[PDB]
Scaffold this active site. Structure first.
Site, PDB file in Angstrom:
ATOM      1  CG  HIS A   1       0.153  -6.837   1.886  1.00  0.00           C
ATOM      2  ND1 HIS A   1      -0.849  -6.013   1.422  1.00  0.00           N
ATOM      3  CD2 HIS A   1       1.071  -6.910   0.891  1.00  0.00           C
ATOM      4  CE1 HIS A   1      -0.547  -5.596   0.203  1.00  0.00           C
ATOM      5  NE2 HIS A   1       0.612  -6.127  -0.143  1.00  0.00           N
TER       6      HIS A   1
ATOM      7  CD  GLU B   1      -2.159  -9.782   4.089  1.00  0.00           C
ATOM      8  OE1 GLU B   1      -1.983  -9.175   5.171  1.00  0.00           O
ATOM      9  OE2 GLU B   1      -2.728  -9.273   3.086  1.00  0.00           O
TER      10      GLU B   1
ATOM     11  CD  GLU C   1      -2.202  -3.779   4.882  1.00  0.00           C
ATOM     12  OE1 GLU C   1      -1.602  -4.650   4.207  1.00  0.00           O
ATOM     13  OE2 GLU C   1      -3.417  -3.534   4.747  1.00  0.00           O
TER      14      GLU C   1
ATOM     15  CG  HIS D   1      -1.744  -1.297   1.267  1.00  0.00           C
ATOM     16  ND1 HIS D   1      -2.804  -1.602   0.437  1.00  0.00           N
ATOM     17  CD2 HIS D   1      -1.553  -2.383   2.053  1.00  0.00           C
ATOM     18  CE1 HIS D   1      -3.243  -2.819   0.723  1.00  0.00           C
ATOM     19  NE2 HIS D   1      -2.507  -3.308   1.707  1.00  0.00           N
TER      20      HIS D   1
HETATM   21  C1  LIG Z   1      -3.272  -9.082  -0.173  1.00  0.00           C
HETATM   22  C2  LIG Z   1      -4.485  -8.190   0.061  1.00  0.00           C
HETATM   23  N1  LIG Z   1      -5.598  -8.973   0.595  1.00  0.00           N
HETATM   24  C3  LIG Z   1      -4.893  -7.484  -1.230  1.00  0.00           C
HETATM   25  O1  LIG Z   1      -5.903  -7.851  -1.840  1.00  0.00           O
HETATM   26  N2  LIG Z   1      -4.164  -6.424  -1.576  1.00  0.00           N
HETATM   27  C4  LIG Z   1      -4.478  -5.623  -2.764  1.00  0.00           C
HETATM   28  C5  LIG Z   1      -4.315  -6.405  -4.073  1.00  0.00           C
HETATM   29  C6  LIG Z   1      -2.862  -6.719  -4.377  1.00  0.00           C
HETATM   30  C7  LIG Z   1      -2.597  -7.466  -5.673  1.00  0.00           C
HETATM   31  O2  LIG Z   1      -3.573  -7.802  -6.393  1.00  0.00           O
HETATM   32  O3  LIG Z   1      -1.418  -7.701  -5.963  1.00  0.00           O
HETATM   33  C8  LIG Z   1      -3.634  -4.354  -2.820  1.00  0.00           C
HETATM   34  N3  LIG Z   1      -4.068  -3.418  -3.655  1.00  0.00           N
HETATM   35  O4  LIG Z   1      -2.625  -4.238  -2.123  1.00  0.00           O
HETATM   36 ZN   LIG Z   2      -2.490  -5.230   2.484  1.00  0.00          ZN
END
Ligand SMILES: C[C@H](N)C(=O)N[C@H](CCC(=O)O)C(N)=O
Ligand SMILES: [Zn+2]
Length: 214
Positions: free
Chosen positions: A102, A177, A47, A12
């Site tokens: 994550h 995670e 996060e 993120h």
């Molecule tokens: C891992 C998390 N549940 C998630 O869905 N993150 C999301 C998608 C990441 C990806 O598709 O590589 C994110 N935008 O961080």
């Molecule tokens: Zn995340």
């Protein structure tokens, strides 16, 4: 171990705007959002700040081991790269291993880590080289005393097809995670400087074990 190349992805952005809602190709026939904000503890610890600070500790330890390192973002306060661009950045370093960090949002009683990996694989490197990375990471995290997630995955592993950052990988990659931000015990550890250090040391043990051929 020394001289290997590892790219680290603190999940993120430091900040967001509506550009994160633009759709990017997901590596498996579809599209998904460029980014999402990520979650936070109920104490307000985001996060994106947890992943940033934990990745900084992982990088510092890897550098001391002689490992060449890079990251997918450079701050925790501005817009960062979209998920497809992050995979491109990782791939451009020709890395021996890639780790995305994550933290999760799940039922409040659920806690522990899960290691996400591409399944079914969309190329050769996402097969045995990546499944071995996922299993080795899981083993190292558990051997360090971390608990496999009680609420998702199978014994701390989660093979999945929906993550663009995994689908687009050209090198061995896992998305860890590290815990559930909505859980009392994991929140306390994520919010603790020494908790982030322990998370980081365990991830580093998993990287070392994988690159050493454990
Ligand atoms: C891992 C998390 N549940 C998630 O869905 N993150 C999301 C998608 C990441 C990806 O598709 O590589 C994110 N935008 O961080
Ligand atoms: Zn995340």
């Amino acid at each position: 171990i020394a001289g290997r190349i590892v790219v680290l992805d603190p999940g993120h952005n430091g900040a967001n705007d509506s550009s994160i809602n633009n759709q990017v190709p997901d590596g498996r026939g579809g599209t998904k959002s460029c980014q999402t904000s990520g979650t936070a503890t109920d104490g307000g610890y985001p996060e994106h700040t947890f992943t940033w600070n934990t990745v900084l500790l992982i990088r510092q330890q890897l550098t001391q081991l002689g490992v060449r390192t890079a990251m997918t973002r450079g701050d925790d306060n501005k817009l960062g790269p979209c998920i497809d661009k992050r995979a491109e950045i990782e791939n451009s370093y020709n890395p021996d291993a890639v780790v995305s960090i994550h933290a999760d949002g799940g039922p409040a009683g659920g806690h522990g880590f899960h290691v996400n990996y591409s399944n079914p694989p969309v190329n050769a490197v996402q097969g045995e080289p990546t499944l071995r990375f996922a299993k080795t990471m899981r083993d190292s995290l558990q051997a360090a005393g971390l608990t496999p997630a009680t609420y998702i995955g199978t014994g701390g592993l989660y093979g999945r097809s929906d993550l663009a950052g995994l689908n687009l990988a050209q090198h061995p990659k896992v998305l860890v995670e590290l815990g559930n931000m909505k859980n009392a015990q994991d929140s306390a550890m994520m919010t603790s400087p020494e908790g982030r250090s322990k998370y980081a040391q365990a991830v580093v043990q998993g990287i070392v074990a994988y690159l050493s051929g454990t």
